[PDB]
Amino acid sequence: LTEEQIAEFKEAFSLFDKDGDGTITTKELGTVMRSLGQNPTEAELQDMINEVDADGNGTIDFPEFLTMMARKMKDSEEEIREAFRVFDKDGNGYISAAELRHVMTNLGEKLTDEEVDEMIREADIDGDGQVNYEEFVQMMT
Amino acid sequence: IGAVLKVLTTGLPALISWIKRKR
Ligand SMILES: [Ca+2]
Ligand SMILES: [Ca+2]
Ligand SMILES: [Ca+2]
Ligand SMILES: [Ca+2]
């Protein structure tokens, strides 16, 4: 495990734990899903927790979250296209800096413009300054 | 449903943290 991986895992956890109490509840999961245009039922959310709820306490702590993500990584093409469409708001096939800014603003991450442009440069493979579907695939896998 | 999970647990965090750790 590298120093790099830990910061990434931390930021991903903090995305969900919007109140910062160090646990992820069904309500936080639902709120994050709805901010991305999804609509999960209470049963689906509980099943999502209980698929990783090692201690049976009804919330997700840090290592259970790691288990959830590692399981999900091992898991699909319909889903990847769905997320792409989550970001390609106007459907032109290229994720722009403006679209990523909009998504970040929806998630609650207060990121500067220069930082979003940095994210685009980091994910951009062909160097056109946008993220196409294939670059998105590369990012996921 | 699982798509949003895959997105918010695989690619996006790497970028956000790789840009945030530079400060
Ligand atoms: Ca919480
Ligand atoms: Ca638990
Ligand atoms: Ca677009
Ligand atoms: Ca590109």
Author numbering:
A (entry chain A): 4 to 78, 81 to 146
B (entry chain C): 2 to 24
Q: Can you quote the paper on this entry?
A:
We solved the crystal structures of both hCaM and pfCaM complexed to melittin and refined them to 2.45 Å and 2.20 Å resolution, respectively. The asymmetric unit of the hCaM–melittin complex contains a single entity while that of the pfCaM–melittin complexes contains four. While the structure of the hCaM–melittin complex shows more similarity with pfCaM/A complexes, it is still significantly different from either of the two pfCaM–melittin binding modes. Interestingly, while the overall conformation of the hCaM–melittin complex is more similar to the pfCaM/A complex, the interactions between hCaM and melittin represent a transition between the two pfCaM complexes. Leu6 is the sole anchoring residue in the N-terminal hydrophobic pocket, like in the pfCaM/C complex, while Leu13 and Leu16 contact the interior of the C-terminal hydrophobic pocket, as found also in the pfCaM/A complex. The hCaM–melittin complex therefore can be classified as a 1-8-11 type complex. In the pfCaM–melittin complexes, most of these side chains could be seen in electron density maps and form salt bridges with acidic side chains, while in the hCaM structure all basic side chains are disordered. Specifically, most residues of the interdomain linker (residues 78–84) are missing from all models due to flexibility, and several other residues are also disordered in one or more structures. It is also worth noting that both Gly1 and the side chains of Lys21 and Lys23 are missing from the hCaM–melittin structure, making it impossible to validate any of the distance restraints. In the hCaM–melittin complex, beside Leu6, Leu9 could be also observed to contact the interior of the N-terminal hydrophobic pocket during simulations. The only differing residues that contribute to the intermolecular contacts between CaM and melittin are Met71 and Met76 of hCaM and corresponding Leu residues of pfCaM.
Calmodulin (CaM) is a Ca2+ sensor protein found in all eukaryotic cells that regulates a large number of target proteins in a Ca2+ concentration-dependent manner. The protein consists of two homologous domains (also called the N-terminal and C-terminal lobes), containing two Ca2+-binding EF-hand structures each, connected by a flexible central linker. Melittin, a major component of bee venom, is a 26-residue lytic peptide, with the amino acid sequence GIGAVLKVLTTGLPALISWIKRKRQQ. One of the several proteins that induce helical conversion in melittin upon complex formation is CaM, which binds melittin in the presence of Ca2+ with a Kd in the low nanomolar range (∼3–60 nM) and forms a complex with 1:1 stoichiometry.
